[PDB]
Design a protein around this ligand. Structure first.
Ligand code: HEM
Ligand code: HEM
Ligand SMILES: Cc1cc(N)nc2cc(-c3ccc(CN)cc3O)c(F)cc12
Ligand SMILES: Cc1cc(N)nc2cc(-c3ccc(CN)cc3O)c(F)cc12
Ligand SMILES: C[C@H](O)[C@H](O)[C@H]1CNc2nc(N)[nH]c(=O)c2N1
Ligand SMILES: C[C@H](O)[C@H](O)[C@H]1CNc2nc(N)[nH]c(=O)c2N1
Ligand SMILES: [Zn+2]
Lengths: 419, 411
């Protein structure tokens, strides 16, 4: 009917009606909950390849209706002409093209609708770069460099998305093969161990297998692997002066900087799909700024990532014989103190998990007040350390799928037919 | 489908869940909205019949006697009781099987690797609050075992018409009192302020100290609850000191050794056991993260951080995180030093992954609530964080029930 959420620390109760506008299956049923499944559902709004008219047009009407409602038209002359324009365009090309305003609206609302994102208080402050005129990998690389430069802004980071041509028949996709624009290589060592970042071992190897000569260090910025109009991907080296990096040091442990650690300042996800009114932008790299835990809890401490916990623990002279000394927990805190201290000292935008979660609670209040709800995925909103001492831990959330949205998509190398 | 797969993204291990086909009651989610983080989303004859059948069939299957002569006669014997008396009585074997499987089925419990080692105390002959007290004392003494804790449950008479319920009004058997002061401050445990007032109103004379063990408030056969003081020599306690910080013991903190939850309802075969206190042993973060460090609890976070000379001006110093770790170190060190059973969140989550994999092997699945299985601190460095889990409701089960003072008709 109409669902309430309660915060068990403040007793604030919020009432959700926005979920009634949700279209896609979450994967749950009355009998099974899938809220901890990474990809619970395959319910897409359109089928395989180029859809028929009765498949694409109703999705397009819905988005156009939604956009003209958002600006307090709907039924206006411009709205009705737009519907005719979309209809003729689908009739004559089997697709349609978004206006600049519709594109900007759709990208912001994809971010506004991203139930897993704790950063959404910023959703309407997003710089949209229209790259729909792009035709080649070289052009994609040019757009990405300008994105990286604008978004980095000498450390005063600015949220941005660059949107490449939409999918047509599915054999002409634009893709950024990288998962993020900036990532460190991972090297599969002969003695079975791993040098660099273990997440990227496979992609690192694709790059090598494509002709990349690895410098074979521990912080090798990977090349860009860009695919335009379904052609074979091409390698490009981001100019180093565009890749802002922060040396990790600790405000008290002077031996910390001697660990020779750094991280990059710009998180820019580049393997997701942006879906607006039935159109699918398979290359839409988007960026904001880091929550400190994303580098220092996940990027340094996952067992299949950097795993430098022990060395920080060893350097801290901790009992590592048994878990009940909580040596992992102690080192994990110090690493996250160090990451934040370094980014703040170099005036690179960063947010701690206490501040980001507090902002999200505020965003939730705003969304329920003016929009009747806010989709939120508790499993992803709660930070990976110190969860119960942040306000989101005690906040009930409702998760549901609204459109426009960002969607997962398969890595292109499982799909690509080379030439 | 016929199968559902769950993946561990750290180890790549993939398990196949067929057990969820046997879940019969709701999760609260719908096909279009997930309620995985909502905390909480008498039977007629014709209602009781199929629920009893399902449970007896399940029990006779478990003992490899399905379809047997004893199975068919038990079935017939149950239907006659339902027909004649509108209820039925579990055999002792079924009671034990039911209690153990309600724990096995508890999707929010990370401790379930131990489920088959549960001491079941049958208290269905109890008739008065005094009798309940006697049963609960023996439970406490048995489970505590001088620090070598043993899990146990004590099952009081089932619900009949809803007007004669047995209830433990306490939420746990052993909790400390909370007193709100005229100046707005709180003495003791702020989580128990409401129940503390209920006890004082029933005549309890509070010591008005910081660690007053609350009295038992016991309701038998639907009568007004009655107060009892647990004998102090039965309440094992642990003074909290720190292995490095000399000053920690000067906070004067202690905790009780035995977690014993007493406000939930045990449901077996449609029968409802409204009074069923059960106990295990602590995971350290249940005391150290939640029992001292929720802003609605003791709030020695600020005290520990002060004594640590931490920069408490900005959050980005992570003073709260730093002080939370040390309190949890102290909790574990103290219990281990006093030889009182406790488990840290790393050991517990690792054991639970082993348990889950074993349940998938022999049982076809294991329902699990990631929101609750993942510990309240250092989540991603524990192995359950990367473990996909399926949540569904099997019966027998433990269920929430409203506080008895909300619905009780005072005599
Ligand atoms: C501006 C500062 C931002 C912060 C601090 C932030 C924070 C986060 C974090 C911590 C996550 C979970 C990541 C993890 O732990 O693995 C997340 C997820 C996500 N963010 Fe944001 N974010 C920001 C901006 C943005 C922007 C600009 C977009 C797109 C326009 C975006 C879209 C998303 C999406 C789609 C997800 C979920 C992806 C998935 O399903 O896996 N975020 N965010
Ligand atoms: C013996 C060691 C045990 C350990 C270490 C353990 C651990 C835990 C923990 C940490 C939680 C989450 C509590 C919270 O974070 O607030 C939990 C929940 C739970 N435990 Fe266990 N437990 C144990 C024994 C038992 C026993 C013996 C039973 C019943 C026979 C039981 C039934 C439950 C139930 C029903 C819940 C969830 C309650 C709810 O729905 O809110 N546990 N357990
Ligand atoms: C825009 C933005 C900023 C930020 N600071 N962080 C993000 C993290 C993610 C994410 C990445 C990878 C995965 C899967 N490993 C899930 C995510 O939610 C994302 F998409 C966008 C982010
Ligand atoms: C038996 C047992 C042992 C233990 N070590 N811990 C428990 C914790 C809980 C619990 C309490 C309250 C709530 C709701 N706040 C959820 C849960 C429980 F029922 C039983 C436990
Ligand atoms: C809002 C949320 O559902 C609630 O605060 C839950 C979250 N997960 C939890 N997990 C555990 N183990 N214990 C809890 O008390 C809670 N609280
Ligand atoms: C199994 C689990 O659902 C999965 O690993 C999720 C859990 N929650 C997460 N939360 C965040 N923020 N980031 C993650 O990668 C994950 N991983
Ligand atoms: Zn769900």
């Amino acid at each position: 009917r109409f669902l309430k959420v309660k915060n068990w620390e403040t007793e604030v109760v919020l009432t959700d009606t926005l979920h009634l506008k949700s279209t896609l299956e979450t994967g749950c049923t009355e009998y099974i909950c899938m809220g901890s499944i990474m990809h619970p559902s395959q319910h897409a709004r359109r089928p395989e390849d180029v859809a028929t008219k009765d498949q694409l047009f109703p999705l397009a009407k819905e988005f156009i209706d939604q956009y003209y409602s958002s600006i307090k038209r709907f039924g206006s002359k411009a709205h009705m002409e737009r519907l005719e324009e979309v209809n003729k365009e689908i009739d004559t090309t089997s697709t349609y093209q978004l206006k600049d305003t519709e594109l900007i609206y759709g990208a912001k609302h994809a971010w506004r609708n991203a139930s897993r994102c704790v950063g959404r208080i910023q959703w309407s402050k997003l710089q949209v770069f229209d790259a729909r005129d792009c035709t080649t990998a070289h052009g994609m690389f040019n757009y990405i460099c300008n994105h990286v430069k604008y978004a980095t802004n000498k450390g005063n980071l600015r949220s941005a998305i660059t949107i490449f041509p939409q999918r047509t028949d599915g054999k002409h996709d634009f893709r950024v093969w990288n998962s993020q624009l900036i990532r460190y290589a991972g090297y599969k060592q002969p003695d079975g161990s791993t040098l660099g970042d273990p997440a990227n071992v496979q992609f690192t190897e694709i790059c090598i297998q494509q002709g990349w000569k690895p410098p074979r260090g521990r912080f090798d910025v990977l090349p860009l692997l860009l695919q335009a109009n379904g052609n074979d991907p091409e390698l490009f080296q981001i100019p180093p002066e565009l890749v802002l990096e922060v040396p990790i040091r600790h405000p008290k442990f002077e031996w910390f900087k001697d660990l020779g650690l750094k991280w990059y300042g710009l998180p820019a996800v580049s393997n997701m799909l942006l879906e607006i009114g039935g159109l699918e932008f398979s290359a839409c790299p988007f960026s904001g700024w880091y929550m400190g835990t994303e580098i220092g809890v996940r990027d340094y401490c996952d067992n299949s990532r950097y795993n430098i916990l022990e060395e920080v623990a060893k350097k801290m002279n901790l009992d590592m014989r048994k878990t009940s000394s909580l040596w992992k927990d102690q080192a994990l805190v110090e690493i996250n103190i160090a990451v934040l201290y370094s980014f703040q000292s170099d005036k690179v935008t960063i947010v701690d998990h206490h501040s980001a979660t507090e902002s999200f609670i505020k965003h939730m209040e705003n969304e329920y007040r003016c929009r009747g709800g806010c989709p939120a995925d508790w499993v992803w909103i709660v930070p990976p350390m110190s969860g119960s001492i942040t306000p989101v831990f005690h906040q009930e959330m409702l998760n549901y799928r609204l459109t426009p949205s960002f969607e997962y998509q398969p890595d292109p190398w499982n799909t690509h037919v080379w030439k």
